[PDB]
């Protein structure tokens with residue numbers, strides 16, 4: 001029935017630079033109009049401000065370029081995303097690609113050099129570990145299908 005969605009994909013200005021990543025989708029707009037797309041930002045939920053410095057995963061740690069360790073906030077935001085899914089009975093997530101929290105197919109490599117690698121963010125990894133299917137904004141058709149199959 002409902003899905004959890006990265007708040008930036010819904011146009012909320014919660015990105016590290018205060019920007020949004022609002023996607024153009026008639027389907028996502030309709031889902032939101034029905035009260036079925038729950039906005040959530042793991043980094044803001046975890047206690048990080050907006051704006052905030054860029055961060056990259058370095059294995060299980062998440063750090064900024066200056067070496068500040070923000071894993072505590074990233075892990076809290078991931079656990080709150082899981083908590084919202086369990087409370088609302090959500091089995092699907094639409095999360096922002098490339099993010100150290102929301103990435104699902106790729107993330108930055110931890111070297112702060114603009115290089116991506118195959119991998120997932122901290123929130124995606126925890127949701128997948130608990131049986132929640134995570135799709136990126138590049139997989140809207142697949143997500144829409146997965147949600148429609150259980151409708152009747």
Ligand code: SF4
Pocket residue numbers: 005006007008009014015016040041042043044096099101102
């Ligand atoms: S943590 Fe996820 S939802 Fe929040 S701004 Fe970053 S990519 Fe978007």
Ligand SMILES: [Cl-]
Pocket residue numbers: none
């Ligand atoms: Cl960006």
Ligand SMILES: [Cl-]
Pocket residue numbers: 097098099
């Ligand atoms: Cl990106």
